[PDB]
């Protein structure tokens, strides 16, 4: 009667500094703005599903999820794990400003993070495989608890 | 003036139905009482270190953390990846009530969480280890998100 709503906004953004696992899957929940982002290596369904998992057990379960028509996202794997979740799921067109503007926006704050961070320890290019997942958690860290 | 302190109870269990990766490293806040779990092959002072930096990202920076005296948290590389961070440190001994009464009660809750889910899915013994993750994450949601 006064309280938001738990919709989330998911993309996958690429981020070479963090190769081999160079993609990123960016989750913004629409009403907090808090960020979720996890590493993958390559953009499949199961990528999405893992990441989601993992959202889930940091911000709670959602009431829907906003993605654009990549094929990760309207797999018959996805829609079959995202039903036995009970999430509702639309879709749209990348970036479309419906339900993609504020993930393109934490794409940018993000990997915006993770430069400074990055190049704060030395590293102008690549990130040393074994500090990346710190260097991650580290972002996310600032920009939710900012 | 009203509101909680920031204290953090951590320890580490092992979990065969976990395996190869089978130390789980288990976070209590002792405020909330939210849980924060990682899977680790092995129980290491950059384990802990791992672990601290996901739960960091997930509950926010606590101003302490309470252990017991294994190496792992009482190495030089322990004690300086704290102090880089500004977390205050106390130890005691294993299951010691004082800080480590509430993450014993956790590991139960916890390992008991798991085997439900896994016998749930048809996995009586150990979980096939492309399944772990999200059954790992699935745990954590049901304990805490109760």
Redesign the interface.
Known sequence: GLGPLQIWQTNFTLEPRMAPRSWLAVTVDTASSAIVVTQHGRVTSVAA??HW??A???L??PKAIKTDNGSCFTSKSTREWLARWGIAHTTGIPGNSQGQAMVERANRLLKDKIRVLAEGDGFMKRIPTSKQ??LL??A??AL??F
């Open positions: 599903q893992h998992a993992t889930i057990a940091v709670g379960r997942g710190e958690a580290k996310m860290y939710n608890h």
